[PDB]
Amino acid sequence: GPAFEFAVAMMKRNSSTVKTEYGEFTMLGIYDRWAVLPRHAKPGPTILMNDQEVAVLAAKELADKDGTNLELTLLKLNRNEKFRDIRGFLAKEEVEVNEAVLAINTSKFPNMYIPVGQVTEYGFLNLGGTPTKRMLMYNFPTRAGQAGGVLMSTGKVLGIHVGGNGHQGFSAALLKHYFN
Amino acid sequence: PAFEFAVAMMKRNSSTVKTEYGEFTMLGIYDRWAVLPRHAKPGPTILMNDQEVAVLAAKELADKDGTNLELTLLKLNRNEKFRDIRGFLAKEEVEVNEAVLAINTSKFPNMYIPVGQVTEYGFLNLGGTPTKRMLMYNFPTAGQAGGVLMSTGKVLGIHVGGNGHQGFSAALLKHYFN
RNA sequence: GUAAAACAGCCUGACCCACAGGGCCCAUUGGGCGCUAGCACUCUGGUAUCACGGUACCUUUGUGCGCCUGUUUUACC
């Protein structure tokens, strides 16, 4: 459909595979030389992006104003190629949709576009012991290595998958103000 | 970098294709026109990147004397036009000191291979058939039929066979398209 | 002959000047220019299609990297 036609373009032009000490993660690039990974990635001073060594110029583990974990890392990479500016495509506040697709790009999960269904705001969650805010939840079995997955609806990036359990999957929301 | 241009080329013009005879890298040259190793011999539909597409033509390529070029040219029913890489095809065959063979298939996902010097080669008895315009590089090679053999600013040809440490690509001449 | 590094750039009377004229391209009376080597985003329009949210190619503009010639500097064949 058009959600699939959006997601495929999205991963083709803005997604990447990234390797850190903890494993393989889909990574999404937002604008200029700036991109987003799970807080859990714990990106080093170098990351293998598409098996290629790239230097990290900066890394913010993202947190709200009262200081609890948002589960996103924003990193600025030292590279000459700039990203397609998708800032028009991510929401101002968390976004509910009846239908979304999660796009995963790892050796494990090559070119994976996965229909999640309804995405609903969720807010607070004690995610493996950590109090984390602004989650979204969709209804699907999630496995390992989809952390980093891109939650999408036509013309809208809704969040980045950061964890799940059994029959529920959770994405950190992706807000406009985090950039610019 | 042959590497940086070849990744560009494979993101914007390459694809993975399934036909009744196997899985092949496919490259699209312009609009809805793309080229395949003649061996696949597309049916009325083919799976392109796992989405089934209708094929409106499939010309098996041959010189004026009628000899086999090992290339099928097919027109796909899709609204998207391919990036016009015709400016990268030489008018006729090109030798190149260092070249890369680029594959996009499930077996060989995102493969980039420095083959080295490529030399004109011409005639070849390809499994019992005489074939013209082969190009030869020295690299060990099956299931890569379809790979895109190229260098920076030059797409030169499509791999169609090999043996041991020798690999041959049907040349890609500018005049073949329109 | 090969490797790092700096200045410059359409041509016409190594640099910086100065004038004058010859040429191409523009989003023009105002400006840009080495590309047989490109890659990336970006901007003006277009063409097509779509669940009207997009997406694909065409073209154009910048900038980053990459590259090519003139000239030259250190350490080496």
From Swiss-Prot, chain B:
Subcellular compartments: Host cytoplasm
Tell me what reaction this enzyme catalyses: Selective cleavage of Gln-|-Gly bond in the poliovirus polyprotein. In other picornavirus reactions Glu may be substituted for Gln, and Ser or Thr for Gly
Q: Where is the Peptidase C3 domain?
A: 1-177
Taxonomic superkingdom: Viruses
Entry annotation: catalytic residues: 39 (for protease 3c activity), 70 (for protease 3c activity), 145 (for protease 3c activity)
The role this protein plays is: Major viral protease that mediates proteolytic processing of the polyprotein. Cleaves host EIF5B, contributing to host translation shutoff. Cleaves also host PABPC1, contributing to host translation shutoff. Cleaves and inhibits host RIGI, thereby inhibiting the type-I IFN production and the establishment of the antiviral state. Cleaves and inhibits host MAVS, thereby inhibiting the type-I IFN production and the establishment of the antiviral state. Cleaves and inhibits host TICAM1/TRIF, thereby inhibiting the type-I IFN production.
Q: How does it assemble?
A: Interacts with host TICAM1 (via C-terminus).
What name goes with this protein?
A: Protease 3C
The shown residues of the full protein are: 1542 to 1720 of 2185
